[PDB]
Each structure stands twice: as C-alpha cells, then as structure tokens.
Design a protein around this ligand. Sequence first.
Ligand SMILES: NC(=O)C1=CN([C@@H]2O[C@H](COP(=O)(O)OP(=O)(O)OC[C@H]3O[C@@H](n4cnc5c(N)ncnc54)[C@H](OP(=O)(O)O)[C@@H]3O)[C@@H](O)[C@H]2O)C=CC1
Ligand SMILES: CCc1nc(N)nc(N)c1C#CCc1cc(OC)cc(-c2ccc3c(c2)OCO3)c1
Length: 189
Amino acid sequence: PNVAIIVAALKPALGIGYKGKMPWRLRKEIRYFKDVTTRTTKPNTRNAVIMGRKTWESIPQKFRPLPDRLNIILSRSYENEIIDDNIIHASSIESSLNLVSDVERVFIIGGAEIYNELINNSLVSHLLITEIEHPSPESIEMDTFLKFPLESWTKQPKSELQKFVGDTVLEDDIKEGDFTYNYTLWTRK
Ligand SMILES: NC(=O)C1=CN([C@@H]2O[C@H](COP(=O)(O)OP(=O)(O)OC[C@H]3O[C@@H](n4cnc5c(N)ncnc54)[C@H](OP(=O)(O)O)[C@@H]3O)[C@@H](O)[C@H]2O)C=CC1
Ligand SMILES: CCc1nc(N)nc(N)c1C#CCc1cc(OC)cc(-c2ccc3c(c2)OCO3)c1
C-alpha cells in the first residue's frame, strides 16, 4: 500500500495550528480532504488513515471514526490491537501495515509530532501538501510549525496530481476570505 502525507500549511513558515487546533476553516479544502482519502481504484478495497493521539481527541467525538476509512491511532501506551472494524491502535506505522490486509492507500492526516517524524521514513513516497498564501503572514498567531526538508523533494506538475486524485476537481488559486491555496504533489528526488 502507498503511504502518503496530506497536510495544509501556510507559506513560508509552513504553520499548521495554534493552541492545539487549526487556525483556519476552509470549506473547499475539507471537501478535497474527504474525496482523496476515500476514493479507491481497485474493487472491494478501502483506504486507511493514520493519525496521532492528540488529533483523534481534537476530532469531534460524535463524528469519529472517519466513515468509509480505516482509522489508525498512533500511541506508545496502547498495544498493537484491533478494537473494531474501523478503529485500530498501533505503536508504530511499520507494525500497523503488517496487522491489516487488503488496503489500497495509506494517508497521514496529523499531527505535528507525526508529520516531523514520518517525513524521514522510507515508506512515505508522496506528499499532498496544500500551500496556503496570505498577504500578511505575521498577523495570524502561530506556534506550531512543520519541519520538512523540501529541498530533497521534487514538486510534481498538475498532470501528475490529477492522476493521483482521479476525477477530483482541482481548482487553481482558491480564494476564501484572505487565504489563497493550491494543491501540490511531491515525490522523493
Ligand atoms: N492543517 C493540517 O493539515 C492539520 C493540522 N494539524 C495541527 O497539528 C497539531 C497536532 O499536532 P500534535 O499536537 O503534535 O499532535 P499529534 O497528532 O502529532 O499527536 C501527538 C501524540 O501522539 C503520540 N505519538 C506521537 N508520535 C508517536 C509515535 N511515533 N509512536 C507512538 N505514539 C506517538 C504521543 O502520545 P503518546 O505518548 O501517548 O503515545 C503524542 O502525545 C494541531 O495543533 C493541529 O492544529 C493536525 C492535522 C492536520
Ligand atoms: C480537513 C483538514 C485537513 N486538511 C488537509 N489538507 N490535511 C489534513 N490532515 C487535514 C486534517 C485534519 C484533522 C482534523 C482535525 C479537526 O479538529 C480541528 C477537525 C477535522 C475535521 C474537519 C472537518 C470535517 C471533519 C473533520 O469531518 C468531516 O468534516 C479534521
């Protein structure tokens, strides 16, 4: 299964959150998030999403786990166990892949502690970074930042991104309030 990292970051500091939660609510970006992590090319198969313990708690308690997707929560306290059909607790990402079978794609959906560690892993080959632009980056309060070495990564064209998402609509320069974001694909050099 292909392991990929999906994230929304504000240029150029690559910020993601403030005081434990996201400092922006983009309606079309959430729709993009729901479509890519669910869509499958192979018959009778489903995609998996790996998240941190703090992200799982921040996600609405009545709207968890995420429907149509295999929810995997990383925790050093919990053992490699299967609770139900959708929720699986694992210590590492290498152990979670061996435990589950018949999975097409694997997505990494948060958070900061997970992003910074899994970027330097051989399993991850693709990045679905949503680069957000703002006229005044200093105005938005931020304390959480991404530590990615994008110099070792190659930015793929829009045609390569379209193949990865399928028939998902990709709009250029999506303006919501003051924010302007674009979907980009990244592969290892
Ligand atoms: N815009 C975006 O694309 C998104 C932004 N975010 C932002 O990121 C922030 C969340 O990041 P953060 O606070 O770091 O929370 P995380 O989701 O990264 O979870 C951290 C917790 O997960 C556990 N953990 C971390 N690494 C491992 C590991 N390697 N093995 C086992 N367990 C591990 C630890 O708990 P334990 O010791 O119990 O195991 C730790 O306390 C939020 O503020 C949010 O705003 C998050 C998702 C998306
Ligand atoms: C959807 C935001 C997002 N975008 C991208 N590009 N990558 C990501 N990893 C994420 C994310 C995330 C975790 C998260 C945290 C959260 O608490 C603040 C709420 C949501 C969330 C936000 C909107 C939702 C939803 C979940 O279910 C469907 O509608 C989702």
